[PDB]
Design a protein around this ligand. Structure first.
Ligand SMILES: [Mg+2]
Ligand SMILES: [Mg+2]
Ligand SMILES: [Mg+2]
Ligand SMILES: [Mg+2]
Ligand SMILES: [Mg+2]
Ligand SMILES: [Mg+2]
Ligand SMILES: [Mg+2]
Ligand SMILES: [Mg+2]
Ligand SMILES: [Mg+2]
Ligand SMILES: [Mg+2]
Ligand SMILES: [Mg+2]
Ligand SMILES: [Mg+2]
Lengths: 260, 180, 71
RNA sequence: GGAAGUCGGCAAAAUAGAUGCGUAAGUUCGCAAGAAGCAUUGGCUCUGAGGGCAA
RNA sequence: GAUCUGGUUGAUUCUGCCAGUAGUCAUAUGCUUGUUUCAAGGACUUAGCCAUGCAUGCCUCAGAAUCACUGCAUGCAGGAAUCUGCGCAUGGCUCAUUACAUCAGACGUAAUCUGCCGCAAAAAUCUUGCGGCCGCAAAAUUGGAUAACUUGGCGAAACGCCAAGCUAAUACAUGAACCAACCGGGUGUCUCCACUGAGACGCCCAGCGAAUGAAUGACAGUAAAACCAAUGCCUGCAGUAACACCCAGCAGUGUUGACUCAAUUCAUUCCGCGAAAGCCGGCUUCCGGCGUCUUUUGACGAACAACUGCCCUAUCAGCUGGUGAUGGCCGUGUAGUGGACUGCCAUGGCGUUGACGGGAGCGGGGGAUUAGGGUUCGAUUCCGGAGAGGGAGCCUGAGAAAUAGCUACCACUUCUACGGAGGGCAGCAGGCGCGCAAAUUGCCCAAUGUCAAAACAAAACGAUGAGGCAGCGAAAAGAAAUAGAGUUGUUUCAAUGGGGGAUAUUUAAACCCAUCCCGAGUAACAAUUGGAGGACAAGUCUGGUGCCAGCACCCGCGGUAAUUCCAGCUCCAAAAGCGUAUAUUAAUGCUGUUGCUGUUAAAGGGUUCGUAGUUGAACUGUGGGCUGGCCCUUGCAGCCCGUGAAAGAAACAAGAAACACGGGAGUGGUUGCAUGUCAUGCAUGCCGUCCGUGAUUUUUUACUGUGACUAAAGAAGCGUGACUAAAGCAGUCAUGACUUGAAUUAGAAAGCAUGGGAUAACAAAGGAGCUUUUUAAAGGUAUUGGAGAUUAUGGAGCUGUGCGACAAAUGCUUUC
């Protein structure tokens, strides 16, 4: 019955300093996993600087001023995660939670039209009472009548304002994906082939836009479009292209010299 | 109290395990029901998670199925006749899963007459039903005698019920010879 | 593994032999392990034969594997 | 109460059958050994094991 | 920096130890200490004993106020107190137990349970009012009891108690017809057909969840045709999802590597399931926030299992054993698997690759030292485990074998009016003992978190010894004062801190730092600790003592001329520090895998036989031809890539070839005219592969190259003028931008995918248990409209006859 979280044990992506407190906020159970989420207090106090401390974070959150997936959330320990839509109407800000090329959490600005939909990955399919097929999603959603072509690897385009599915994208050989876990998290690539090893982890081989090869486990890929040029979601600035470490350092040095 | 852990057992090498922790509630056991034949009496038991187990102390009625006809009936239990663990359980008349009992055969006779028109309206569906259908002589002999053998299929100490199925086929002959 | 003993009823003992590396003396030493495996009447293994086994739920105090194929 | 009696535990008391478990020093390896010691046992109603010769 | 020196001889060259030397967030003690930053701190011995105080509670607009409570004029509130709901199983402390236990990396639960949080689901139920069981109607206006309180109190007291009287609910109990559907099973009276079939009608019974029984939970080895009875469609077999009307397409199609799983229908049986019979708000209605029962899946957890690894000891060699030891069968118990446990059966399981027993130890991340290989430490911040004086037992609860919960015994112990009643600091401060050995009975919830009936504010401030702040503190680590510049043969010049104060700044409030002024000439604002024969830097100095006193880590000094003792002077080393003791790393190739010795220095067994173990000979194997007289460098391309033999046949390819699957491929991959119209038919058409299933036959392990999967803190290091640095992850520049940054790496072994075949390992064998193809004949499932039966004809294999063609790694026109 754990209800605390030491700061040294908290995920590195939250970017909390080791010298400014013994504890970190422990996320509650919810739509996303504890190790793969970002609590609302961290979003509002760190990252965005609307709150200077936890006292001001509680004032903002308990008034219902922050909407996640078109619903007010009043808990600072609420776990927010991949592809969630966060809107603060009083300020007039809209973001989506994504992974940048370095694997860190990134907030991508959205237009009003783009804020109405989110991509949902199927993780299970079962039959409910009365012979009703149900699809379970990577964020804990349960869809009561999915498209008859839905499979466990597919992606569903979901309108959150009307609570209705609009489109289905299948996991095939010629589709574009983004990596959600492992050493390649945040990279955008194209499927080349999938290796099936029954009873163990399937392995996917992918190709980057620059021709670089990399592989991950099949449970870490997320379909986002029919090819590398027609993506159904907006991605961060770097477009999921890993850059050479030697080259990246050289450009940063040159930019510093010119800026000064 | 009673425990179900492996700490007190010997190792396969014959050595002794040195225990360095106290007993935990998550590994308990409880005393057996020892269900007997008699007027109904049960006792509820609060198990892990808040759910309730029904511990039956005495039972005399149950729900018994005729598998060939895919039907069932509620009948009175008369005796315990055989038990594979030991015959001291037959002497005390203890009810457990997979023991052989004798039940009342009157409700099954009534269903046969009303479904096939056979004693052991214009629309005669009976002629259709008797077509390509036959009954075993071993069963019909008991149905006329009044009592018929059956096998308990439920666990009375876990659910509080004594349900079962009638013996047919080669399993009936197996237990008839063991009783002879 | 290889079959070591077949004296019990519907259960056998198998042996797995392997080499273990010692870093300080850059050399190996022989080691082995023993397991109890349930054998179904579909197979008739003999001492010295090689089998393929698969993990299952606990079936006794020591048995955690089942024979799947005899070579 | 328990050898204070008496030269001296003389005399008396005391132990006790059968079955299971268990058993020291010493030793010519045979013993010491029933070492010492612990436990069970009635009556009644039942259940199992241990055979023969006739096809 | 991959380093050595003194001591055995009258001299020499060795072996070998003793002594010297440098580190330690590594402890303790001695002498000393001006400034500032950063920090460990009753672990070692006694998981010893504890006075006193404090450490866990929670109320919004939104569950219950008639305080005989408080203001102000009927509405408020600190609304006291109580009932109700949630929490108190987390955090904090400690390391006593412990070696197939725990733990690390990697995995399983298809063997299970799971409050709070997320997304969802819901059609069972005869109730109420009036009138006389019936009839008429519908916004169902449901019932009883208990606290706080009042009265009488008992008791020396007790986080001790009794009786009576009042009264709330989101406490407890009861309970809702018609509105209101689809679908099915069993059975009686009416119409019709035929001589059975169809349709009414009645009559039952059909919700979620649980139990037992019966079906479904697909197919994916052959094709043409007759004959019966019942049916469909045409006027005899074309055309054809299925189905006797209201519905002419209202499921012929769940998931997985795999399921007795998901879900559905039938029979019988439970005997847990409110629309809180709830609370607020905005506008007569309408709308919106909460709150709660049951069902089902994610998430957060719990419990179980074990693939590889995990100290010393043989003056510990056998251990276990139906008395549960290893396994089997039917049961019981559990949330669930299981000798976990009852009954019966069989005789197994483990061990020199070290079982069993004994001893010292909580396990990791990691620390010290080190050219490399190594040696050693890890009570202690993060993760895992275990405990609350000892030992058992248990209730509540989603979760405890809970201890600032209960029950008992043992050892200690407190109060008493003697009747009785209490206690558990290995939480924070403190105290006693123990010791070589370790702080204040301080301030605060401002920050970081946790709980919760809860934003903040307004009459109107939740708790928190977790946590933070300061006091003590030469454990350890950074930066740094004790002066500087000059003129003549002892006299001047500026400068600044320590310190003392500030309009002030910092801070929850204080303190420290930072900023700024009245202040140095024995700048008395006065530096120490060890040494001066050698190792080892530095005195033939001057007195005293006289093998005494004493020094001396070792070698050695001292017996009246002491380079060594006690002193003065002068010098040396490190310096706000420097000695001593005990452990430990290097020095140490004096533990030797890299890397030691064994004739005489310590050490080859008296000689052989022999089992585990270690080690073990050669061989299957130059590819070739053409471009820029053999051979070799290069760059080219293309080869059946020895030899045969031109779609097949040689060689390969289980990663491959044979079979079949429309429920295989986003619709069956690639190379306005017709069909239907009762139509939401609003429909339909204009050679290589993919996927499932069957048949056929075979190669690992190991090493090596990549790749995947792998908590921080710590180590390495990319950037950055916190004034530098030890640090930290920040910050930089002109109603904001940098679409700011916070890169990257290594981490044993075991586990996962793949490609490469040289050196090797495992297993098998022990060489006499060792033909193909093409036609003729004899014998013995699928298509016929669909569904159920009987029937020939054929496919194919089983075989015994003839015939054609081609091979053969060993001559049949042959041998005997
Ligand atoms: Mg006596
Ligand atoms: Mg006497
Ligand atoms: Mg006398
Ligand atoms: Mg006598
Ligand atoms: Mg005796
Ligand atoms: Mg309460
Ligand atoms: Mg079983
Ligand atoms: Mg160690
Ligand atoms: Mg004791
Ligand atoms: Mg204390
Ligand atoms: Mg001197
Ligand atoms: Mg002198």
């Amino acid at each position: 019955a754990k209800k605390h979280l030491k700061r040294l044990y908290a995920p590195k992506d939250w970017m909390l300093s080791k010298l400014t407190g013994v504890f970190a906020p422990r996320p509650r159970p919810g739509p996303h996993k504890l190790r793969e989420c970002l609590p609302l207090l961290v979003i509002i106090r760190n990252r965005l600087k609307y709150a200077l401390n936890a006292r001001e974070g509680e004032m903002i959150l308990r008034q219902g001023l922050v909407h996640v997936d078109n619903h007010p959330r009043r808990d600072g320990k609420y776990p927010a995660g991949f592809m969630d839509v966060v809107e603060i109407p009083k300020t007039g800000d809209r973001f989506r939670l994504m992974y940048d090329v370095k694997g860190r959490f990134a907030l991508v600005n959205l237009s009003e039209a783009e804020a109405q939909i989110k991509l949902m990955k199927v993780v299970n399919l079962y039959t409910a009472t009365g012979r009703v097929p149900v699809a379970v999603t990577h964020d804990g959603h349960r869809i009561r009548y999915p498209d008859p072509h839905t499979s466990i690897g597919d992606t569903i385009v979901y309108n959150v304002k009307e609570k209705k599915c609009v489109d289905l994208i299948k996991n095939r050989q010629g589709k574009a994906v983004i990596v959600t876990g492992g050493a390649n998290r945040g990279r955008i690539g194209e499927i080349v082939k999938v290796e099936c090893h029954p009873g163990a982890f399937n392995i996917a081989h992918l190709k980057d836009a620059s021709g670089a090869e990399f592989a991950t486990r099949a449970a870490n890929i997320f379909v986002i479009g029919k090819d590398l040029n027609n993506l159904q979601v907006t991605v961060p600035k770097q477009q999921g292209l890993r850059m050479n470490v030697i080259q990246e350092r050289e450009e940063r040095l040159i930019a510093a010299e010119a800026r000064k | 109290g009673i425990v179900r852990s492996r700490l007190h057992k010997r190792k396969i090498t014959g050595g002794k395990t040195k225990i360095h922790r106290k007993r935990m509630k998550a590994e308990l056991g409880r005393l057996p029901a020892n269900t007997r034949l008699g007027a109904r009496r049960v006792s509820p038991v609060r198990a892990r998670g808040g759910n309730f187990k029904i511990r039956a102390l005495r039972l005399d009625t149950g729900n018994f199925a005729w598998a060939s006809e895919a039907i069932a009936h509620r009948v009175r239990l008369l005796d315990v006749v055989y038990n594979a663990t030991s015959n001291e359980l037959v002497r005390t008349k203890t009810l457990v899963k997979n023991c052989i009992v004798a039940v009342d055969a009157a409700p099954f006779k009534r269903w046969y007459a009303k479904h096939y028109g056979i004693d052991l309206k214009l629309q005669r569906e009976w002629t259709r039903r008797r077509r390509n259908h036959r009954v075993e002589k071993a069963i019909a002999d008991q149905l006329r005698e009044g009592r018929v053998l059956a096998r308990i299929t439920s666990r009375p100490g876990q659910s509080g019920r004594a349900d079962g199925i009638l013996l047919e086929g080669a399993e009936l002959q197996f237990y008839l010879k063991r009783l002879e | 593994g290889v079959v070591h003993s077949t004296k019990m009823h519907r259960t056998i003992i198998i042996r797995r032999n392997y080499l273990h590396f010692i870093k300080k003396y850059q050399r190996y030493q022989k080691r082995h392990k023993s397991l109890a495996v349930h054998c179904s009447p579909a197979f008739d293994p003999k001492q010295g034969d090689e089998v393929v086994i698969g993990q299952c739920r606990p079936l006794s105090k020591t048995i955690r594997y089942n024979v799947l194929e005899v070579v």
